[PDB]
Amino acid sequence: RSKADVERYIASVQGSTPSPRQKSMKGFYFAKLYYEAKEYDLAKKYICTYINVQERDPKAHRFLGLLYELEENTDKAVECYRRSVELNPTQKDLVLKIAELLCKNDVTDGRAKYWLERAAKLFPGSPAIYKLKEQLLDCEGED
Numbered sequence: 001r002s003k004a005d006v007e008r009y010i011a012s013v014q015g016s017t018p019s020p021r022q023k024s025m026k027g028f029y030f031a032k033l034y035y036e037a038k039e040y041d042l043a044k045k046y047i048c049t050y051i052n053v054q055e056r057d058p059k060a061h062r063f064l065g066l067l068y069e070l071e072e073n074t075d076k077a078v079e080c081y082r083r084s085v086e087l088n089p090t091q092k093d094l095v096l097k098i099a100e101l102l103c104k105n106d107v108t109d110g111r112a113k114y115w116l117e118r119a120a121k122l123f124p125g126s127p128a129i130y131k132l133k134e135q136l137l138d139c140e141g142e143d
Contacts, residue, residue, distance in 0.1 A: 001037040009033060024053035028060055035067070043067055058087035062094065074105040092122040096129075103132045107139040 013026050027050025035043040047064045054060060065080030078101060081094045099119040102112035113136055120129045 001033065003034075003037055003039055003042070006030065006033045006037055006039075006042075021053060024049060026050075027053070028057070028063070031063065035063075040067060040070060056087055058084040058091070061087065062091070065094075069101065074101050077101060078111075095119045095122055096126075099132060100128075103135055107135055112136065 010030060013023060017023070017026075027046050031043050031047035031050060034040075034046055044064070044067045047060060047067065051057070051060050051064060061080045061084040065077045065084060068077035068080060078098050081098050085091050085094045085098075095115065096119045099112065099115040102109055102115055106112065112132075116129070116132050116136060120126075120133070123129050
């Protein structure tokens with residue numbers, strides 16, 4: 001998919017449902033299509049426009065989180081995933097994802113241990129959990 005293909009669709013929306021809210025209601029579509037075009041900076045731009053007018057859509061915060069994760073922007077990805085979980089807490093997968101991202105970025109972060117413990121409740125006996133905990137134990141300070 002090209003930037004031009006997505007532009008054509010945006011133009012069609014402008015021509016038939018031109019109001020500000022109507023256009024914003026199409027921003028998740030625009031963002032996914034730009035993501036398909038591998039236009040990542042534009043995908044971020046447009047998912048942000050949709051979150052503006054549909055702030056409680058957990059799928060939209062998750063998708064914005066995905067874009068930030070692709071940039072290895074740990075803080076922004078975590079914030080987005082956290083909001084998505086708050087809106088739809090059945091997403092246990094995101095709790096593990098947050099823990100994994102924080103551990104990859106900075107073992108020595110109070111945040112990594114906090115999320116790891118939240119994830120451990122949701123994934124009893126998980127070797128993914130046990131591996132992160134090993135990493136945290138390795139970097140613990142000594143009394």
